Design a protein around this ligand. Sequence first.
Ligand code: HEM
Length: 153
Amino acid sequence: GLSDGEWQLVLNVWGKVEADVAGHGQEVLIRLFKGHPETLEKFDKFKHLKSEDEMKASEDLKKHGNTNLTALGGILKKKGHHEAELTPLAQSHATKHKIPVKYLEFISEAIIQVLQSKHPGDFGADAQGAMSKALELFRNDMAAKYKELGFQG
Ligand code: HEM
């Protein structure tokens, strides 16, 4: 639902994530978890992390943050025409991971805050609004897939 110009602003700021996927991923998860503690309960592998210092040392957290943004990236790059990339994610998150649409809103917030915290200079008003739209489109399509699979959108 983005203009070609909005996609270009998205992909340009995503270029900065691609220069350090894992560090960005780590910081999004830690923002997510510190901001919304209940989200951490969906990760059996990350219970034992009782502080931001434990989260920061966790090599598995960092790997997972890398896996997560690499997938998000694959989606963003398709600029809307992302059905093939989006389905497997909606499938696994609607079924095996039991991730509610609302949590998708929290991680979208955390993504924006990380971008804003690491790249304040490049993440101006126009880039912010385009990234918000792109994440909103991702959330909306995930929710439409969940409802088609028989789950809550
Ligand atoms: C930008 C949104 C998200 C993206 C792109 C994303 C991506 C991924 C990917 C690529 C995987 C690995 C393959 C799979 O199982 O599908 C995964 C696994 C997983 N995701 Fe997500 N995810 C997102 C949001 C979330 C949120 C918000 C939660 C919890 C609140 C979550 C919980 C999980 C869990 C629990 C797993 C399995 C982890 C394990 O190996 O123990 N995801 N995610």
